[PDB]
């Protein structure tokens, strides 16, 4: 909000990327302008 | 020169050395700069990702062989 950190967390990111892909694919359903749907 | 040599990623030397490796090595050394290419370290131990990081996700082995 404001490296070693994410490393430690994985010890004791991919989920955010999957969330982003879910968001983009979902948003593609509502896109009226087609080229934007292809972009998404 | 980086982005170019990156195309050689599949090119192996006569010793089985990925030409990419050497070429990039001579690259770093000759160029005499790593900070911009491979990054900088922040005081709290966060490694500020540098140029090479944009091309590969496996920065570990790369920097390692460079250090060798």
Q: What SS3 class is residue B18?
A: strand
Chain B within 8 Å of A4 (Cβ-Cβ)? yes
Cβ neighbours of A3 in B, within 8 Å: 42, 45-49
Buried b / exposed e over A23-36, threshold 16 CB at 10 Å, is eeeeeeeeeeeeee
User: Roughly how many angstroms between the first and final C-alpha of chain B, as a whole number?
Assistant: 22
Which method was it determined by? cryo-EM
From CA B68, how far away is CA B46, in angstroms rounded? 22
CB contact at 8 A, B62 and B27? no
Q: Provide the 8-state DSSP code for B12.
A: B
Interface test with B, best of A2, A4, A13, A14 (most B CBs within 10 A): A4
Nearest Cα residue to B31 out of B45, B51, B46: B51
Resolution, expressed in angstroms to one decimal: 4.2
CB contact at 8 A, B40 and B48? yes
User: Roughly how many angstroms between the first and final C-alpha of chain A, as a whole number?
Assistant: 25
Residue in the structure block whose two tokens are 């160029």:
B31
Number of H helices, E strands in chain A: 3, 0
Sign of CA dihedral B4, B67, B51, A20: positive
């Amino acid at each position: 909000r404001d490296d070693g950190i994410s490393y430690r967390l994985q010890e004791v990111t991919d989920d955010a990327v999957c969330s982003k892909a879910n968001e983009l694919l979902q948003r593609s359903r509502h896109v009226p302008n087609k080229q934007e749907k292809e972009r998404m | 020169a980086l982005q170019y040599f990156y195309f050689l990623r599949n090119e192996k030397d006569n010793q089985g050395e990925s030409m990419f490796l050497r070429c990039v090595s001579e690259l770093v050394i000759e160029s005499r700069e790593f900070d911009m290419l491979l990054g900088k370290l922040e005081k709290d131990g966060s490694r500020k990702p540098g140029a090479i990081d944009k091309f590969t996700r496996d920065t570990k082995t790369i920097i390692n062989k460079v250090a060798s």
